[PDB]
C-alpha cells in the first residue's frame, strides 16, 4: 500500500496550517544570526528573546512570501512553484 | 484609372510609436472638466455645498495619473509572466492582490 502523489502533500498542508510551532531549528539559526551580526559592530552578545523574535519575523516573512509565490504559480496555470514566481512576487511587492 | 493607396501599417508599429511618444512627454492625459465634475459629484456624498480650489484638483489629477500608470506598469509584468501580450482584468486583480490592495 502506497499513497498517490499529492495525498501526503495535502495532509502536510492540513497539519502545518493547523499547527503553530516553529519549523526552523534553533542552533543552526543561532549560528547563522551570530555570524551575520559581527559585520556591523565588534563583540556582539545576545539575549534569547532577540533571536526568538528574529525567528518569528523570519518565518512570518517566508510564509507571506510563499503565499504570493503560490498565487503567481496558480496564475501561470501551473502547480509547481519556480524562482521566477518569487522574482515576480518580489518585483510587484516593491523590493 | 483609379487612385491607389500605398499600404497599411502592421498591427503593433503605431502602438509602439505611441508608447515612445507618451513616454517621452510629460503632460496631463485626462480631460480636466470631466475629472472636475467627477470629483465634485463624488464629493457631494460627504458634505453638501463645498467649494474647491484649482491646485486641489490638479494634485488629485497628478496623484490619480501616477497611481494608474504604476498599476499598468505592474499589470504589464503580470501579463508578460502569464505568457501573453493582451492585458486581462485578472492581471489587474492579481496586481492589486499581490500589492496589498
Amino acid at each position: 500500500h502506497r499513497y498517490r502523489p499529492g495525498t501526503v502533500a495535502l495532509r502536510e498542508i492540513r497539519r502545518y496550517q493547523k499547527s503553530t510551532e516553529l519549523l526552523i531549528r534553533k542552533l543552526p539559526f543561532q549560528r547563522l544570526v551570530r555570524e551575520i551580526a559581527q559585520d556591523f559592530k565588534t563583540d556582539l552578545r545576545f539575549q534569547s528573546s532577540a533571536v526568538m523574535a528574529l525567528q518569528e519575523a523570519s518565518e512570518a516573512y517566508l510564509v507571506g512570501l510563499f503565499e504570493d509565490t503560490n498565487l503567481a504559480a496558480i496564475h501561470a496555470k501551473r502547480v509547481t512553484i519556480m524562482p521566477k514566481d518569487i522574482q515576480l512576487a518580489r518585483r510587484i511587492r516593491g523590493e | 484609372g483609379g487612385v491607389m493607396k500605398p499600404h497599411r501599417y502592421r498591427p503593433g508599429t503605431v502602438a509602439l510609436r505611441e508608447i515612445r511618444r507618451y513616454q517621452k512627454s510629460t503632460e496631463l492625459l485626462i480631460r480636466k472638466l470631466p475629472f472636475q465634475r467627477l470629483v465634485r459629484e463624488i464629493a457631494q456624498d460627504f458634505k453638501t455645498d463645498l467649494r474647491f480650489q484649482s491646485s486641489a484638483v490638479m494634485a488629485l489629477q497628478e496623484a490619480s495619473e501616477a497611481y494608474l500608470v504604476g498599476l499598468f506598469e505592474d499589470t504589464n509584468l503580470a501579463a508578460i509572466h502569464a505568457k501573453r501580450v493582451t492585458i486581462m482584468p485578472k492581471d489587474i486583480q492579481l496586481a492589486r492582490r499581490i500589492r496589498g490592495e
Partner: protein, 103 residues
C-alpha cells in the same frame, strides 16, 4: 558674524535651531545639531542639483525642469531608494520597452 560663516556652510543655522525648538521634538535641542543637520541638507541639495545640472546639460538646456529632476533622481541607485514613495508633479516616467514586445 553669523554661525553659517563660522561653520562655512550655506544653509542657515538660526532658522534650523528655531524649527528644532518650535516643532515639539524634545524638551531640548542640543547644539552642534543645527550645524550638523544644515551640513547634511546642504550636501543632499548639492548632490540633487549636481545630477539635475548634468541631466539638464545632456539635453541642450540651460534651465532645470521637473523632468530633469525626475531623470536625475530615477537614474541613480540610492536616490531612487531614498525617494521611492515620492511622486513628483509634471515628472513623467522612464522610457523603457520590454524585450518580448519588440519585433
Amino acid at each position: 558674524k553669523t554661525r553659517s560663516s563660522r561653520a562655512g556652510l550655506q544653509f542657515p543655522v538660526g532658522r534650523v535651531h528655531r524649527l528644532l525648538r518650535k516643532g515639539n521634538y524634545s524638551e531640548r535641542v542640543g547644539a552642534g545639531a543645527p550645524v550638523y543637520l544644515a551640513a547634511v541638507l546642504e550636501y543632499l541639495t548639492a548632490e540633487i542639483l549636481e545630477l539635475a545640472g548634468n541631466a539638464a546639460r545632456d539635453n541642450k538646456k540651460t534651465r532645470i525642469i521637473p523632468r530633469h529632476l525626475q531623470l536625475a533622481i530615477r537614474n541613480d541607485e540610492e536616490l531612487n531608494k531614498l525617494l521611492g514613495r515620492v511622486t513628483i508633479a509634471q515628472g513623467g516616467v522612464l522610457p523603457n520597452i520590454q524585450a518580448v514586445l519588440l519585433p
